[PDB]
Design a protein around this ligand. Structure first.
Ligand code: RWS
Length: 185
């Protein structure tokens, strides 16, 4: 892929974060805390899952960013509609306004409904995410394996502004404490 030149600087929006998340001062890293992080509740916060949005909203153009997933057991990454549901239980699907992939229990899947098995020979330490708004495309790349394609959502119906989407995952196992990090351009 030659999408690197559409690189955008993503920062995390504290106001959308689950109340257990800890975002770094530079707003480029997020991890699950061991308790409530002493913030007030608001209608933006994801209540049921350790999720947060990027501050940036995209309604046109081509955008690229990279996320570090080193030593994590579980995570979700991608984009979502600005108007996705925040409270209660929901599935990650395009019908619900999400275009995502995840790791959980030693397998990688795309967030279609129902979900799709991914075929990854080299476990990624960094993921590239490419959005072509006009084309209706969201693609995921394995930076660790020379930028190899993971998955393409095509014929996407975004139906609104898009926001970068993150889930650091739970840490029931004690093996998933590591952060998600937005990698430098
Ligand atoms: C002013 C505000 N508007 N909505 C708020 N909520 C507090 C958290 C639960 C949902 C209701 S704060």
């Amino acid at each position: 892929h030659h999408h690197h030149h559409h690189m955008v600087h993503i920062t995390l929006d504290r106001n959308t974060a689950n109340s257990w998340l800890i975002i770094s001062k530079d707003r480029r890293q997020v991890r699950m805390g061991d308790t409530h992080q002493n913030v007030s509740d608001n209608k933006e916060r994801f209540s049921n899952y350790p999720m947060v949005l990027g501050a940036q909203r995209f309604s046109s153009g081509k955008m690229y960013w990279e996320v570090d997933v080193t030593q994590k057991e579980a995570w979700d990454l991608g984009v979502c509609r600005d108007s996705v549901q925040r409270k209660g239980q929901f599935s990650l699907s395009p019908e619900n306004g999400f275009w995502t992939i995840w790791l959980w229990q030693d397998s990688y899947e795309a967030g279609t409904s129902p979900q799709t098995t991914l075929h990854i020979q080299v476990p990624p330490c960094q993921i590239g995410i490419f959005v072509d708004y006009e084309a209706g495309v969201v693609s995921f790349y394995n930076i660790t394996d020379h930028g190899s394609l993971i998955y393409t959502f095509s014929e996407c119906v975004f139906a609104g502004p898009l926001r970068p989407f993150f889930n650091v995952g739970f840490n029931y196992s004690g093996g998933n404490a590591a952060p998600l990090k937005l990698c430098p351009l």
